[PDB]
Write a protein that binds this ligand. Sequence first.
Ligand code: CLA
Ligand code: CLA
Ligand code: CLA
Ligand code: CLA
Ligand code: CLA
Ligand SMILES: CC1=C(C/C=C(\C)CCC[C@H](C)CCC[C@H](C)CCCC(C)C)C(=O)c2ccccc2C1=O
Ligand code: SF4
Ligand code: SF4
Ligand code: SF4
Lengths: 73, 38, 83, 80, 154, 119, 741, 61
Amino acid sequence: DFLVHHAIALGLHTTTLILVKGALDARGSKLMPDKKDFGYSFPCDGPGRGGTCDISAWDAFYLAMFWMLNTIG
Amino acid sequence: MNLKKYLSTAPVVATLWLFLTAGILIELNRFFPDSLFY
Amino acid sequence: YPLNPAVIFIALIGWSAVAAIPSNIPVLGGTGLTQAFLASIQRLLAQYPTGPKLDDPFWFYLIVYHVGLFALLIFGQIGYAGY
Amino acid sequence: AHTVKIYDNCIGCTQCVRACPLDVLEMVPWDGCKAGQMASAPRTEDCVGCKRCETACPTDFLSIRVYLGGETTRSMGLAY
Amino acid sequence: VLTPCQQSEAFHKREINEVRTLENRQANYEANSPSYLALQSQIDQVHKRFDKYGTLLCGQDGLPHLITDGDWRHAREFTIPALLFLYITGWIGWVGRSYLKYTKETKNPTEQEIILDVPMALKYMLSGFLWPLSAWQEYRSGQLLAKEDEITVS
Amino acid sequence: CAETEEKYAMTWSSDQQHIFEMPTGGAAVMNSGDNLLYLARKEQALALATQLRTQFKIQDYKIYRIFPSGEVQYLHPKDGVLPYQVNKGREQVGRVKSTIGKNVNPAQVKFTSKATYDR
Amino acid sequence: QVKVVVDRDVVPTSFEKWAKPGHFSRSLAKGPKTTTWIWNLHADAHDFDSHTSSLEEVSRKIFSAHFGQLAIIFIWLSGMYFHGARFSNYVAWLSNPTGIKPSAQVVWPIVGQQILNADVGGGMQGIQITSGLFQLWRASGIVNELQLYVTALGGLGMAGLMIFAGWFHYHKAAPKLEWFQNVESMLNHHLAGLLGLGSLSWAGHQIHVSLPINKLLDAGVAPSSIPLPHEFILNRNLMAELYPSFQQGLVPFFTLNWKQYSDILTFKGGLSPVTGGLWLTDVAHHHLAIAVLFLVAGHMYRTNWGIGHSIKQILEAHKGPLTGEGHKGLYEILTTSWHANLAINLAMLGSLSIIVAHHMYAMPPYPYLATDYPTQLSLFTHHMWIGGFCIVGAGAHAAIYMVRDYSPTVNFNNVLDRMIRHRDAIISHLNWVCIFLGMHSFGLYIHNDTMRALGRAQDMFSDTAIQLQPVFAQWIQQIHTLAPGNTAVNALATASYAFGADTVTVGSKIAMMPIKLGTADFMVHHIHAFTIHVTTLILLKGVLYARNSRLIPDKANLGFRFPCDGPGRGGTCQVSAWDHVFLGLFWMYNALSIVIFHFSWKMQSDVWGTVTSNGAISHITGGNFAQSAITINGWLRDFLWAQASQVIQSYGSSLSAYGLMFLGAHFVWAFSLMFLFSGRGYWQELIESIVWAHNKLKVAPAIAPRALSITQGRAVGVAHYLLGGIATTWAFFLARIIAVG
Amino acid sequence: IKKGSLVKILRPESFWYNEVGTVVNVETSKVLYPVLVRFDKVNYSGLNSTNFSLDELVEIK
Ligand code: CLA
Ligand code: CLA
Ligand code: CLA
Ligand code: CLA
Ligand code: CLA
Ligand SMILES: CC1=C(C/C=C(\C)CCC[C@H](C)CCC[C@H](C)CCCC(C)C)C(=O)c2ccccc2C1=O
Ligand code: SF4
Ligand code: SF4
Ligand code: SF4
């Protein structure tokens, strides 16, 4: 009970870390603050400014699906 | 002369500190093994 | 590019006759490399469904004769490279 | 088409046009900067949208911002 | 129910089972083998291992559980290494914060972090010993914190 | 293919028979006097323009865009001078008044066929 | 001509530039304004063709670096000889090898982990060897601890000569490029001098050490009555008793009466029925054949004396019509570009290591090697895995040639780029072969999977069902049965007992059994041809589309480790010639994971195990391959569910460290997926949202904390996917076969 | 205002937003973004050297 329930609270706070991340940095981040302009699930911003694989607010869904299946797992 | 600058870098002092505290843990777990109290 | 499609049978002269008279006895064929084959195909040529994996001189002298025969006809088309 | 817009941060250092391998970008003499230059994107019908311009855009934050719009034959970059 | 562990049955079942099970390898050697002396030392390190867990609480599992309430009868279980630990990484954290607010005002702060200035480093390593009433008195000056740093659009 | 897609035929001249690299691949013969070169897409062609121009002088070069109706186009240059160089003929399109920091919020653009920056 | 011009006092040897990290790259000597400088410091630590284009300075750097590598290898082998000396039970192992399990490493007694010291016999415990060092020492004739100590100290001596040699050949005597492009001499000394005198001198060691010693140990002499290899050369009399051709001296050699040397050297093949290894008469005779054959081979390269070839006049002479120019240019490619040489040598080195694995399982060349099955397994598996990775190194460094060091002026209409003219027709037919083999290598498994699951086992691909008996492999294996009487005239037994006669048993342990190949072994060979063709697809797509694709027609202008181009062309992620190597490492993991999952389960069903009274048979799974390899539930159940059971129940025992390196390797495997799936457009402002929490408490790090780059943020997903993925099968395999064999 | 002055920014898409920085060059020829300001730390383009207008020119004393 103790160890698993810490693992479940781990799963919840990670999954809400992803979701509240890509739901409050959904509008604007300091990598690119133009994220309100490209809509929700735009692919990227290209390799500029270090590289920009999965900056969109669709990464909150995208990564938090893996953490959702992990946690409900 | 400039060897002591190399012995002041990040990975070397990282090994000379994690090696040292690693030896604190191992030498503190040979002398007092199975330490769940205190 | 193949400007000379002249002769193929010069390999059949060129590979059988160099492999008939050297017997080199204590191998599978006590006769030569080809004499152990032409005798071991006429037993099977008249629509014989046999010739299993234990049929030695049909399969083995199939491949070892085709692998030198292919090589000598290919080298026969290399015999139209010096032109 | 992939709409390229070039804002008023464009101080005309021309790494954008030299960085675009499609010549959608050209430089226009614009008397509002020190170099007197400001980039333009007239031929966005050939614009791939590869954002190779935005890598080499040394402004504060991206004078030239590429918005991914239409997808024609040329703008998708298919060979056949 | 957490029985006191020195009298729990399955605990002493694990005592007999592990002393006997590890003892089964001890009859594989002669009376003066180095391995035989090593398993003498290991049997000693099992009886000491089970006598030194006497005041714990092993339940029906025969395995010593812990309690993290701060009951002050379980203080040597959790809260004494809790305060001990918080002292140790309060040490480490105040060392690292103090060294970064050193190298923030130097000549080149980039080269300061590759090559640690072991003079000033081992100054701050040892000087950050009393971080509650030094970090607290640097908090009362309004200096541990900051204000109006970087942020995104809103 | 060539009966339905815009073939890109790159026409240019040189002085000596050098050897460049195709965007299809491998080394090309590079006729010394004057040579045209059919291609498939524009990035191949201006990538070849970077392939030759950054090495040496290949000026008086531009692809005639063979659109499948039959005729040509001319883009690089149009006024005869190199694009990052500045000529006084080009009219700038594609600007706004300020940075992204004054672009409109997309809830002010929602249910309208506008952009997130036109204002 | 051939002359050696050497610069002296090239580089001063102070510790000054150690204080300047990234001294070497002017692109990277700016210092870290970001944390990406930290990882680019290590990603440019060995980009020697990115420091300076001057091939002289590069070539000095690499040639001095090889001595550092050989220094680490001599420290490694001196380590193995010392852990053989002080820590191993090798002296006691030499008495009864079939009872005593080999152990060197004796785990220090800290909390719990002293239980890893497995009581393997010999009176002294420690964790069990699977590397098979004791079999190479019994083959090499090392009797007692003294040769292990002394050979260890000579290993440190050669390690000192390689450190001092590399320092000596970068700093105070380093050569010119004209020394390096003198390549006919380099082949001339590596074919002859390295490999020729290596195999010849090793034939000296086997004839004057191993043949008397492993005749005495074959006779069962205890390791105290055995004389030293010392004492066999003071007099021929101790060897004329063992081999009575030593009495004649070298006189029948110089008169070419080599019939007299049938005692020392022969051509028997097979295996020793007593030791379970190869006949060292055959092995010493073999190294003589490599000796004379390679010393013949070395002398075909004209260097100073106008006798021999040059590579130029060879490659020009093959001016074939369908290639046009012939091989013109390859002597200028391979003597000016190092990365192309690394592509060829890593391809042939890796495929040699695979060849090593396949030749070691079926012709076990060391005495008592096929007796202890973990050393038989893991020396197949290990050499199979490095034998894999080096082929991806070929697929990478071929592309690193094609991106950096390609020049179309030297490389115009030859055999090379005429491929690249029709690389669509290369990669398209690899695409077809990959789909055709995927259907016909794995669709058969979904077929047998369904037909066994649908009850209709009459429609499977078993021996009872629709059979797929491999015709060609059984036929040529039947030829290998008929070798030693017919074609190998002077042989006695076959090339192996994986081919011909009845099994060889040593100590009631099956050393080698003739492997039967029916209708399941077939389909796994088509797995292997399939997943070999997919790696060939990704590693030829990585080379033919390396420099200028039709998607992106300027990749050499972008580089080798560039991540992408952009979202244009609808997204061009992962498109570089490095990214194909990123993919070929996962397919390396696939292809070799099912190679060893063919090996370690066909030879736990068809070869290994014990023998009982009246010569009766007993395998480990008990013939449970052809009725079970045909499906996947038979594969996963009957292999991965059943063979795991000795890794999983391994707690409380000495096999529990594999029970830790099993779960932790599942952790590292699963931990790679975080790097593979996400990207730095997430992690960069996740991290910067943490940088707010450092800027609030003034703990802002002065080196700015970026996330990883893209190519690092996928290279690390490879290097965890492979470390965790490989260490799972490592712990699974050694915990499987140590628990029984 | 002048060169060398330590200037906080008030533009939300500046990477150095609410961070002080040093002034390198000011042009008085009606350039819309004349005040070139570089910084200690570094944005994602690797480049500390940017420029600003006059409304985003807030100094410290
Ligand atoms: C200078 C030392 C230092 C200090 C005082 C802090 C302090 C803090 N970090 Mg942290 N951090 C550090 C280094 C440091 N960090 C390093 C080096 C890394 C990279 C691994 C991180 C990564 C990190 C993350 C990812 C997160 C924090 C967070 C936090 C906050 C919550 C506490 C926590 O869980 O820490 C976390 C502690 C760790 C992740 C491990 C400790 C890091 C190293 C191992 C110890 C640091 C000692 C330092 C290297 C000594 C160098 C100086 C010395 C040589 C002179 C707290 C303000 C969290 C936050 O925002 O909460 C509000 C958060 O999510 N940190
Ligand atoms: C017959 C002479 C000879 C021999 C034995 C070797 C042997 C070797 N060369 Mg080599 N080489 C030679 C001539 C020779 N070379 C010549 C003439 C050239 C110039 C054309 C080169 C150019 C060359 C390059 C460019 C490279 C090598 C490398 C290697 C090593 C491959 C690794 C290996 O197999 O480890 C097995 C290790 C051994 C068998 C130990 C060998 C040590 C013995 C004592 C022989 C060494 C004698 C030494 C060369 C004499 C120098 C004379 C000097 C002392 C006055 C191997 C040591 C590679 C390497 O790793 O660099 C070192 C490498 O990159 N060689
Ligand atoms: C008469 C000398 C001689 C002897 C006694 C051996 C003995 C052995 N070799 Mg062998 N070998 C030899 C010459 C010899 N070799 C030559 C000349 C080559 C190079 C072509 C090889 C290449 C070779 C490889 C690649 C391997 C062995 C292996 C073995 C061992 C397996 C046992 C067995 O039945 O093999 C009997 C050996 C043979 C049937 C090989 C015959 C090779 C003939 C002599 C080649 C003649 C060269 C000539 C140019 C003709 C080439 C074309 C020809 C086929 C028509 C055994 C110790 C295997 C091993 O390592 O064991 C684990 C192994 O993998 N050998
Ligand atoms: C288990 C997961 C999985 C599967 C099935 C595949 C399958 C495939 N990959 Mg692959 N891949 C995977 C994971 C997987 N990959 C992963 C994890 C990576 C990460 C690195 C890659 C990376 C990768 C690369 C880089 C490449 C491939 C390629 C291919 C194709 C090889 C050609 C072939 O085998 O065709 C045969 C197809 C199969 C064996 C799939 C099963 C088909 C069954 C047998 C028949 C059809 C089923 C059914 C009847 C359909 C009809 C019913 C339905 C319509 C309702 C093949 C489709 C290559 C490619 O593009 O093709 C050449 C290629 O270049 N893969
Ligand atoms: C790709 C591998 C593969 C193969 C070879 C087979 C083969 C077979 N399956 Mg099958 N199956 C597969 C995958 C495969 N399956 C998968 C992946 C599934 C699950 C989705 C199933 C599910 C399944 C079921 C449920 C059943 C079968 C059954 C069968 C059998 C009869 C099907 C039939 O009539 O064939 C149709 C064949 C053709 C239409 C022929 C087309 C292919 C020809 C040969 C190509 C020739 C081209 C030629 C070479 C061109 C060159 C020459 C030219 C240039 C002149 C047959 C043995 C049935 C059975 O009872 O088994 C006995 C059955 O009930 N299968
Ligand atoms: C987690 C993750 C990160 C974040 C990884 C962070 C940046 C690295 C964390 C480990 C480093 C090494 C921590 C640095 C700590 C130093 C070692 C100092 C600590 C003190 C001692 C240990 C020496 C990425 O940058 C990334 C990029 C692209 C795709 C996926 C990912 C990704 O999944
Ligand atoms: S970031 Fe991801 S998407 Fe944007 S370019 Fe690099 S790879 Fe393609
Ligand atoms: S915007 Fe950036 S890149 Fe485009 S011109 Fe002005 S400065 Fe050069
Ligand atoms: S969008 Fe792609 S093509 Fe158009 S400019 Fe920016 S980078 Fe060059």
